[PDB]
Design a protein around this ligand. Structure first.
Ligand SMILES: *[C@@H]1O[C@H](CO)[C@@H](O[C@@H]2O[C@H](CO)[C@@H](O[C@@H]3O[C@H](CO)[C@@H](O)[C@H](O)[C@@H]3O)[C@H](O)[C@H]2NC(C)=O)[C@H](O)[C@H]1NC(C)=O
Ligand SMILES: *[C@@H]1O[C@H](CO)[C@@H](O[C@@H]2O[C@H](CO)[C@@H](O[C@@H]3O[C@H](CO)[C@@H](O)[C@H](O)[C@@H]3O)[C@H](O)[C@H]2NC(C)=O)[C@H](O)[C@H]1NC(C)=O
Ligand SMILES: *[C@@H]1O[C@H](CO)[C@@H](O[C@@H]2O[C@H](CO)[C@@H](O)[C@H](O)[C@H]2NC(C)=O)[C@H](O)[C@H]1NC(C)=O
Ligand SMILES: *[C@@H]1O[C@H](CO)[C@@H](O[C@@H]2O[C@H](CO)[C@@H](O)[C@H](O)[C@H]2NC(C)=O)[C@H](O)[C@H]1NC(C)=O
Lengths: 99, 593, 593
């Protein structure tokens, strides 16, 4: 159930996806959409098995891409509650207001 | 364009092939470790699917024309794919040849020779006749065993060989080869850049050239063995004559290793065996493989995979599953490397573990290469790489370093001489038999030997080359070569000769790389990373490049050389020259008692 | 360096040549449209200057050696430039050959056969004898016309042919060709990258291979035509015999199209002719060309130039200038493309307009290429590209789409069958005559046919290949081939055979490109831009690349294939098989009444 694209006419641009299953035409003759000699289906199967070597075992990859745009940034890291001390002279940072 | 089409075809093939080959290899492993009917049928279907896919791809691959392909790696991959082999013939001929091969295999497996005047004592070759050849000292019993197996096998197998040669010749001609011998010699053919080109015809002359240099050492060994056998057999062996066929310690005379108690130089001095030391320290098979791994990392080759430790069997399972005794190294594919060996805690098993690990390391190095090129450079190389590790493991320096042998051990000349003689009996002795048998097979396939004169030629060559005479005259109704396992089961025999030359050449090259300053037989390649890299350059290549290039990469030469073999056996050769001065070195062709 | 010198020479040549060629083409156009003595003399000077310049450049070009030129386009341009043609011979021989050609042309033009016992009724071939061959049903009158023209032309032209062959052989040998037949076969020679190489010798075998496949369809057609003629002529045609030479609807039997009323499958069903619809809707020649332009833009080829509309004549001028009736497409050069056709408002002229526009589109596509390479890939390609458009234009779908044919029109099987039979009589019938005539000419030039046995060979081959027998015995004093226009005026005839194969191959390739799911004969390529691009890739190339590469570019094959031709005629072939079951298919070589 895990597949990869082995054959494509042109290289992918960054952050592009191709879902086409069209038969890859490597030869002058038209494929006609039926698999035939010199015509290979692009999507091949990753036949994962438990006894494979470490190079070939399945690995799950998550890629995190961060982008900044002219719009205000709304994804930021956690804000520390810290603690509240009263009746003493303490430097205060309340919602970005300092003193 | 044709080259681009071939590249895409190979790319599609490698992905489909690797998966199917892994399934076939896994099924074969499952049968070998856990012998049963269901694993055998599963193996049969897996092999059938893999073979059908391989033939279908080979038929498509044959459409491509090699003339317009410029890149060597794609051309070599297509060459490997395009070898039809036995499929070239028509279905009727292929079925007849397969039937002949299967009947030959079953008849050889079930071969029976029985005692005259003692009907109940009927003996198979595998349980008992081999034991008689290895251990019995009685002349008459050995003569009976040799003659009886020769008579039964030769009379039954002579017609089968007669049509077997014709069918193999038809298959070879169908594959654009002159004869079946040329088809076997194709495996050493290398097509490449200038000065690396090797031809099938060249191989015969190269073997003869190597043989001539080997011949004085063999003659001295033959004279010494003949004198010792004469001491064992007082009147049945002539001083100037050839050795009898049944006194060589083996059924066919293939290995002289069983003659070592009779031919020992120094009976008083013990062997270098360290089995008892392993027993005292509680060593086990896991420790043996770990020590082998330590040697491989120390030389600089990579560590064993986790899968190798997890999936392999290094011990008899003893849980009710039948196993094959023979040690085998398996490259299943997709980075799966396993060893099936029922390892007992002995020195011989320790050397065998080093040999099989060497096979696994050789398989691991060329895993980067494409699927069709994940093989040895030739048949000899794969065995040779394991053999050099076996040679290095057995040295006294290696045994002292790992604590098997005591630190204060003294290496006198006498132990070196007897150990070298045992090595010569196993290694030097097999070479004339191998050369003579291969030459006979090549000439029979060629048609140089007339059909009705086959036996008459073979004994003459054994008289000429091996220097071993028949005990009793044999007419042409006999088929004396066919008694051997390799010829009856369609196996090439020249690989052992090439293995023997390559093993010493590789060993000398590594020892020169490691800056060893002593005798070649005492050399150890441990803790010499540069030697490991020098070896690994050949190991990574596989058969992507011509075998001559790989040979140049290790030894700096492009052809077989037996000067390392003479260098390894030089103290023994000097000793044999010293003790043969009174005696006559050489044999007379005419039959002498 | 030689290659750079050739490149500069070609660069200088293209600029000078294009201007001189345009002047010659413009003068030729001015004579053709406005026939007069002054335009003829102007054309003569323009052609003389262009020819003199071309020979002078060719003589300079011959100094260059092709061995050290690596780039294919420069080598091909130099090859085209270096063809001396008739200039290779000495002045005396060239003058004699020119005199023989001129006398042959004038004698053929002025050929006269006159009625026996009726002296006043003397008939030329062009005004009246062709009409007799097309329309007359009387056996004796046709026999008279055929025999009389054969006797007068053959007796006068036999010596002229005898020295004509020798002079052509000398010219071909002077140009490093084996014979004049090899010189004609040179036009199909392609030198290029591996697997695209085509040889002159190969062409004959390729034609024979195509012919064998074509032969069953021709045999069935011949049997059907023979039966219909037997119905027309009760006792003068044998069931098992060959057809008489004078009953084929033409003077030479080249086209069987005039036998269609006699051989109609369904007399009751009308033809697909749309002339009356054009008359009702007030169509004119401008509309016909505009509709052709609409088809070409719809398929994706470029629009016609403004110069084409402004300068061409599409109507009889009727202002007192004489014109040539024949439609011709002119590529004057420098982007000037014109059509000279006296277009009447008929279906046939509409198809002719599509064919000539196809020629113009073919000329326009390769305008980017250098001057020497602004030609067809071979002689067949230029005619074939027009023919595919003519095939597409005539389909019922195309006529319905443009409103010539009513929307409610029903296409029954019978109209398809009679239309296919008419197409076969025009197209399939010409192929045995073309192959036999070209084979005879090639063997005569080679010398395979003995000089004194020429007639005896030709009739035999007509009996063997065409399946047409002579009405009366002819001895060797006759020159029966020479009565044809193409042979008497030194024209190659194999172009029609290649055109016929290429036309169907191109049509099938375009229909597969256009994803048509029906019978090939009903296919229309309108509104299929991908098919237009697929065609245009070949059209742009010209003869810059080998013709095999262009053929691969359109159909995916590198050689002539007649499977599209069989596919086009498959319903007709099935119908002919269905109706020939009682009759005997084939002919007997011996003369049968
Ligand atoms: C290849 O290199 C390894 C590591 O350099 C060598 O192993 C080392 O062998 C020596 C001598 O056998 C060991 O020295 C002695 O070890 C004993 C036991 O621990 C100790 O009691 C002595 O005081 C002395 O240290 C050394 O420890 C050992 N090192 C390791 C890491 O195992 C090996 O001998 C080399 N092989 C060859 C063929 O040169
Ligand atoms: C190729 O494409 C062109 C353009 O799509 C096709 O022309 C179109 O043909 C259809 C049917 O013949 C026309 O539809 C009908 O036209 C009549 C007359 O105007 C009108 O009364 C109907 O109500 C309906 O619209 C369509 O107008 C016409 N379009 C153009 C721009 O001419 C042509 O038939 C196609 N050819 C083939 C072979 O597919
Ligand atoms: C040896 O092989 C047998 C059969 O080839 C294995 O027995 C199977 O075990 C699986 C899983 O436990 C069961 O699903 C099958 O039904 C069993 N088959 C039979 C015939 O018993 C056995 O487990 C294997 N042993 C080892 C050690 O691999
Ligand atoms: C047809 O050709 C004739 C002669 O080739 C053309 O008549 C010439 O017209 C030009 C331009 O008016 C004059 O300069 C010439 O002197 C004319 N020649 C003669 C002999 O009178 C005529 O114009 C052409 N017709 C067309 C329609 O092109």
């Amino acid at each position: 159930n895990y597949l990869y694209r082995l054959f494509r006419k042109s290289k992918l641009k960054p952050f592009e996806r191709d879902i086409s299953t069209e038969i890859y035409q490597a030869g002058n003759k038209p494929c006609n959409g039926v698999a035939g000699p010199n015509c290979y289906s692009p999507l091949q199967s990753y036949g994962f098995r438990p006894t494979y070597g470490v190079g070939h075992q399945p690995y799950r990859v998550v890629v995190l891409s961060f982008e900044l745009l002219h719009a205000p940034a709304t994804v930021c890291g956690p804000k520390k509650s810290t603690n509240l001390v009263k009746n003493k002279c303490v430097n205060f940072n309340f919602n970005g207001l300092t003193g | 364009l044709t080259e681009e089409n071939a590249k895409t075809f190979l790319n599609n093939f490698n992905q489909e092939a690797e998966d199917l080959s892994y399934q076939s290899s896994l099924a074969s492993w499952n049968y070998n470790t856990n012998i049963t009917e269901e694993n055998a049928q599963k193996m049969s279907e897996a092999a059938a699917k893999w073979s059908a896919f391989y033939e279908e791809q080979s038929k498509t691959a044959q459409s491509f024309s090699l003339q317009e392909i410029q890149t060597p790696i794609i051309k070599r991959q297509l060459q490997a794919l395009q070898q039809s082999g036995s499929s070239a013939l028509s279905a009727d001929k292929n079925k007849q040849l397969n039937t002949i091969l299967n009947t030959m295999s079953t008849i050889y497996s079930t071969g029976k020779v029985c005692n005259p005047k003692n009907p109940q004592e009927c003996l198979l070759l595998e349980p008992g006749l081999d034991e008689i050849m290895a251990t019995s000292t009685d002349y008459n019993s050995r003569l009976w065993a040799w003659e009886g197996w020769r008579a039964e096998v030769g009379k039954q197998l002579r017609p089968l060989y007669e049509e077997y040669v014709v069918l193999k010749n038809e298959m070879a001609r169908a594959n654009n080869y002159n004869d079946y011998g040329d088809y076997w010699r194709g495996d050493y053919e290398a097509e490449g850049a200038d000065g690396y080109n090797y031809n099938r015809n060249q191989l015969i002359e190269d073997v003869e050239r190597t043989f001539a240099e080997i011949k004085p050492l063999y003659e001295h060994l033959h004279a010494y063995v003949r004198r010792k056998l004469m001491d064992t057999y007082p009147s049945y062996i002539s001083p100037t004559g050839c050795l009898p066929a049944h006194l060589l310690g083996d059924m066919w005379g293939r290995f002289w290793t069983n003659l070592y108690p009779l031919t020992v130089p120094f009976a008083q001095k013990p062997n270098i065996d360290v089995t008892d030391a392993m027993m005292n320290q509680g060593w086990d098979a896991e420790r043996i493989f770990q020590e082998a791994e330590k040697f491989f990392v120390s030389v600089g080759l990579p560590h064993m995979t986790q899968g190798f430790w997890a999936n392999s069997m290094l011990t008899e399972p003893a849980d009710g599953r039948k196993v094959v005794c023979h040690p085998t190294a398996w490259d299943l594919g997709h980075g799966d490397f396993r060893i099936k060996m029922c390892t007992k805690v002995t020195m011989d098993n320790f050397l065998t573990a080093h040999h099989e690990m060497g096979h696994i390391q050789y398989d691991m190095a060329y895993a980067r290469q494409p699927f069709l090129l994940r093989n040895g450079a030739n048949e000899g190389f794969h065995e040779a790489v394991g053999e050099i590790m076996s040679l290095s493991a057995a040295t006294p320096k290696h045994l002292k370093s790992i604590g098997l042998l005591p630190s204060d051990f003294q290496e006198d000349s006498e132990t070196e001489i007897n150990f070298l003689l045992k090595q010569a009996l196993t290694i030097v002795g097999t070479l004339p038999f191998t050369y003579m048998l291969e030459k006979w097979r090549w000439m029979v396939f060629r048609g140089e030997i007339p059909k009705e004169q086959w036996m008459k030629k073979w004994w003459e060559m054994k008289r000429e080359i091996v220097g071993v005479v028949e005990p009793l005259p044999h007419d042409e109704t006999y088929c004396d070569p066919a008694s051997l396992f390799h010829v009856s089961n369609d196996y090439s025999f020249i690989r052992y000769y090439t293995r023997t030359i390559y093993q010493f050449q590789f060993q000398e090259a590594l020892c020169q790389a490691a800056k060893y300053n002593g005798s070649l037989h005492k050399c150890d390649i441990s803790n010499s990373t540069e030697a490991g890299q020098k070896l690994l350059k050949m190991l990574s290549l596989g058969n992507s490049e011509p075998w001559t290039k790989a040979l140049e990469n290790v030894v700096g030469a492009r052809n077989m050389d037996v000067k390392p073999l003479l260098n390894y056996f030089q103290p023994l050769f000097d000793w044999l020259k010293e003790q043969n001065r009174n005696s006559f070195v050489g044999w007379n062709t005419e039959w002498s008692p």
